[PDB]
Amino acid sequence: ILTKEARSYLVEKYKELRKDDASYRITVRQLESMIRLSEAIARANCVDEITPSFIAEAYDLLRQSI
Amino acid sequence: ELTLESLSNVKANSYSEWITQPNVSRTIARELKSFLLEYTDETGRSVYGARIRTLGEMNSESLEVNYRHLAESKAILALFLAKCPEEMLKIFDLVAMEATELHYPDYARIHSEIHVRISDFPTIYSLRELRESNLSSLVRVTGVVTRRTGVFPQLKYVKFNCLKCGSILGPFFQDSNEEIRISFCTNCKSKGPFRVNGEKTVYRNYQRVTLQEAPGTVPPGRLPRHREVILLADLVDVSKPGEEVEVTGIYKNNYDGNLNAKNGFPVFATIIEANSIKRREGNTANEGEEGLDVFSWTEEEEREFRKISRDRGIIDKIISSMAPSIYGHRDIKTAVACSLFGGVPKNVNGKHSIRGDINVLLLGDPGTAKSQILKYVEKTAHRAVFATGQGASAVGLTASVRKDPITKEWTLEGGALVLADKGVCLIDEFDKMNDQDRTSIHEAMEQQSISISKAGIVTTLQARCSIIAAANPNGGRYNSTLPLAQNVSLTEPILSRFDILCVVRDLVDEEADERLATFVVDSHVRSHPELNARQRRLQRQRKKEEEISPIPQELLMKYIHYARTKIYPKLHQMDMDKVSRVYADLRRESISTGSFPITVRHLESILRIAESFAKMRLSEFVSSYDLDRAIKVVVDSFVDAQKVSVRRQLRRSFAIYTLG
Amino acid sequence: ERVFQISFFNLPTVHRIRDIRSEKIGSLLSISGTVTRTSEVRPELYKASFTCDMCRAIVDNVEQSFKYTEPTFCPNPSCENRAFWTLNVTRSRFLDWQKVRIQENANEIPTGSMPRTLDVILRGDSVERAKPGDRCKFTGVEIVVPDVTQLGLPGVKPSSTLDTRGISKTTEGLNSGVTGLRSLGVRDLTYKISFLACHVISIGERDQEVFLNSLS
Amino acid sequence: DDDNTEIIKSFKNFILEFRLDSQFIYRDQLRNNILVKNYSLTVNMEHLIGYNEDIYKKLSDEPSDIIPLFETAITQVAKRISILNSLPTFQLILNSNANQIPLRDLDSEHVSKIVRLSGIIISTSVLSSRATYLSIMCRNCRHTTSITINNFNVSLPRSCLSNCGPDPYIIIHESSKFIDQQFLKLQEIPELVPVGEMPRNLTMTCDRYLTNKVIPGTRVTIVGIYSIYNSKGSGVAIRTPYIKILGIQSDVETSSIWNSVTMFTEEEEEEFLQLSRNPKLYEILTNSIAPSIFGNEDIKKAIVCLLMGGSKKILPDGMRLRGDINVLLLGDPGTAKSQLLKFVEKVSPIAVYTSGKGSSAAGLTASVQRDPMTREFYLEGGAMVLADGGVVCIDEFDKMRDEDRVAIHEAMEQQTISIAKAGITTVLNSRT
DNA sequence: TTTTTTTTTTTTTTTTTTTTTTTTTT
DNA sequence: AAAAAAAAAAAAAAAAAAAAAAAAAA
């Protein structure tokens, strides 16, 4: 599941990515994919709570491919 | 006499013989009648009394009984019905007729027997997992209708006559799957010729259908299985060839000579005698809900409809309740609601027919939730068909011609637009489509009919269908510095047939992006899957609906169905001059600067939208507010499809009409 | 009572489809092949029960081999009745039945060959355990199946071997059919080899609580 | 026999004693019909109800049994009012004003009851022969015998009358009398079909004076009896329903062969010649074409000219000249092009409306089919065959495939269709 | 590139007739 | 010895119409 600070970090990172793009390549689907990657990385560590470090890792993975 | 405690113990080593005993069958009937008369739900209203009251009003011949109600109280009768359907149903029909003759005495002059339709059986099987242990028991099976024999009369009480003794034999109840065999005489004492006792007999309606397994249920890459289903009176023509259905019935066996001859072992044939039918074509809400039709209403529900219909701002709440989890795009939601409620068809003196359905087009940038809106429309609509791009053909959205395997005569078969008569056909990715396939809907979009002249068949069908289409612009993205005609490949003949056009643009905005991201993250948080508990589930599922839905979806579905079925508003008093001026101004501002074709066909769309907004209020007369709202919608749909250079001037020029 | 079944496996040697000769009919064997067709799970009549039309006496446990067999003598010798019975389909016992078609493996097929086929009968709990395209090893008893159509089936539906295609002229009179039996009449009975299998083997949940149960 | 005699007497008294004002209408109709060799009688049910309700109640509950008694009452009255005898058994034709029942509302509740319904004729079969008076002889004793049959649903006796065999009897075909039988196929009205359902068809049988009265595509009203016949479908004890026609009302005055004779009484001819003398008849006819369409006067005048049509000439050298008008409308969307095509369909006595997208060359000109039973090839008509002597309205003409569109070239001008397929080489007429 | 062109692929049996020659059955 | 009933005996197939693919080009 997602915690309270994780949502704020997610929206901040989405806003930063959208700002950096300028809407040609970045859409809502990118935010959904970041959520998916964060959940998968959390499943890797066998933890039922999501930490902003996981969102940072997912953001880095998204940035590495764009 | 016995007691409900005494029915637990069983004798005769068989349940059927235990049920059919004279002393047991008198306690069973009394308990069933007490269940019919005295059952109450949480709110304290007897439901079966209301159903019986409606039965006589509608001149119905059947009663619907929920299995959960009869299992919660008197569970022994529920188990008996589960294991032994044939003997229980005969008693339950008689007690149902006796209960019915307490609200409508002398009802026997309308219908002589009352049939009982069982609903919500707990265990659902697939055709692949039917075995011999399910023989002579009630089962629930989903499938796809493939072929239908047609309606013929069938004997009910069979009689025979013998000539040498002139004996008349007593009435025999036919099995409906095995021919009545009689060879012994009570009087002739020997073999004698037997006649059919011509005339003076009672018939029933009989039909046969074949159910294949649904493609979704079948494992990927395996051959499907099929079974035969017999439909008796009151159940004929309910299911149509091509639909997907769920049937509750009895699984039986019979001896066939050919089956034993070919296989080489004493194997038997199986067939299902249908008891209940539920349609599941386009329905994804089958996860919940109870009953045989979730689009039907009761008396208290109709009273609640009329109660909430007189609140001010009902239209605003209806619009806000369309696709609640999608953020923004209120014009798309308004267009979807207007298409869903629909207009009123007309015929002037029986020689001039006028269409009454609204078609919607969505042209927008990728990633703007158009497909999810189409899926929501599919879920909410009563009759819906879905198609996409290159997966549809000219005759797949129209009528096709096939040689009948049995009759060997050319015959007509249905299509997507015919399966959605008085419904909605959705076409995703409408621009990535062949022109020959796209041009097949020209007649159905306006004339609402299909004409075929093939292989000696010269016929005209009927397709009263509404089309909501989604497309992508040229280059994948919309150029706001160009007119519409150079952003799409479609020409005027197909663009004129659409009533509402919604251009969706994605633009860079920090606050808008922040709000959209917050809404989406909250939605993902909400949808995460992690007294009686089965009602705690309902209250928890209602708490989540409270936030983003002003009215529940299950209530809204019945509201839309009732509004479409019952209401037919008119246009007695209205302002003709305003509409004429608006039409003339729209025509003038198109050739001068614009690429949106406006003809007489767009004058009637304003009236259709006005009638739709009148329907939303459950009113029988169109007022000034609805007409003004329709004019505003049409004007806003035209102004926002212009170039950025002339849009500011056009908006100011058209602003006098929409003063409110 | 539970109709029991005995399943044998782990036989010393395995046979191919081209080693099937009539001198092993009735013996316990194991075979291997690739499945190419399966049928529906039909109910087979195991223990029949009837009622005399006149006495109403009940007969039970009437064994059937390959065709619908009704009893001959009434339970009471006082009654004289040779026929006209009524099957009590409710009292009778049934079993699951399935027919599968198999062919030879890719390696056992010679350089130039049209693959040989066989009919394997799965019964009881062994239904649906063989899926088309898979390679399975069957074990059971090799039997022989007669043509029941010319054995006098009760109904007129057989209609004395109604056909849609033309039979082979090459084997017209070449297939040795036995005559003489009174049930046959002047007809000729024919046989073909099939297999009956009792054991089948193949040779070619996000819930934490239940997951923790299975592991050691 | 002690009730049939009284029934026949009641019917004869009805025929001979019914009077309105000062004229026995049913007595005069018989004499007028006999003179022109029409052996039939038409009775209105309202008069029968007014005369006596018991007689109507007897007929309403047992039609197949009672109707022949009225049949013989008519021919008993005829021989009294015509002769002081080659008069066959007369025919009864009935008229009703009861509510019309849709085809899909006909079920097991309506068996052996007289019903009234409407539909569209799609096919008419050929005439067949049914026996009424059979001359019979035995194979061994060889003596004459006779049998009388009425067509309201018999076999030769399964015995001998005076060892002879089981049922030894043969028919002496000479000195036997026969009548005319025809089979027709019906279909629902297109606007009455329920939602999502394809139209259904039904079978009807007509006799004697009701044969060769309708043509395919006609909209008719039928009065008859709903019955079943056992025949032949793996269902147990199921029967096939059909309708025996008793009365036909047709909108088009044309008979089966369209005699090209006047079917207009003088009261209508006077009206037509009075109309023709109107000095402004052209404007009146033009204004009547689609009164809900604004403007487009020239197109409406052209439609009137197409409806009336020109003259046709035949020359000594065998030349044939076309006398029909074809019209093309190539224009912009929203200009009411498709609302005139459907009006021309309604106004024209014979007209077919088709779409170019859903069409084919076989469906438009003619097709060839194989009979499941006979296993031979026969010709079946198409859009241009049904719409003979009328108008065909082809919509979406630009969307037609190029192979299908070229099949109309010969029919448009030479007004014939040549088929040279599967051993069948014929030329069919098509004047549309 | 989206237009026209092209092969091609099941579509088939459900019905018939009165003799003539066989088995049962009073 | 003389009746009433009950199946065998089919065979056959080309010739045409409609619909969906997998190769050609202004």
Ligand SMILES: Nc1ncnc2c1ncn2[C@@H]1O[C@H](COP(=O)(O)OP(=O)(O)OP(=O)(O)O)[C@@H](O)[C@H]1O
């Ligand atoms: N307000 C929103 N706007 C856009 N997308 C949204 C919104 N809220 C949620 N989404 C999600 O964004 C995703 C993109 O939506 P979708 O797949 O329908 O886009 P699309 O480009 O219109 O699709 P298609 O090409 O299939 O028509 C979906 O998963 C949807 O649920």
Ligand SMILES: Nc1ncnc2c1ncn2[C@@H]1O[C@H](COP(=O)(O)OP(=O)(O)OP(=O)(O)O)[C@@H](O)[C@H]1O
């Ligand atoms: N002059 C007119 N008078 C009255 N109604 C009109 C007129 N022109 C168009 N309409 C209306 O416009 C609507 C659409 O017209 P119609 O269906 O006949 O179009 P069309 O000419 O066939 O178009 P298309 O070329 O797109 O097929 C109908 O409701 C029709 O009544």
Ligand SMILES: [Mg+2]
């Ligand atoms: Mg048109």
Ligand SMILES: [Zn+2]
């Ligand atoms: Zn008798």
Ligand SMILES: [Zn+2]
């Ligand atoms: Zn006995």
Ligand SMILES: [Zn+2]
């Ligand atoms: Zn004789």
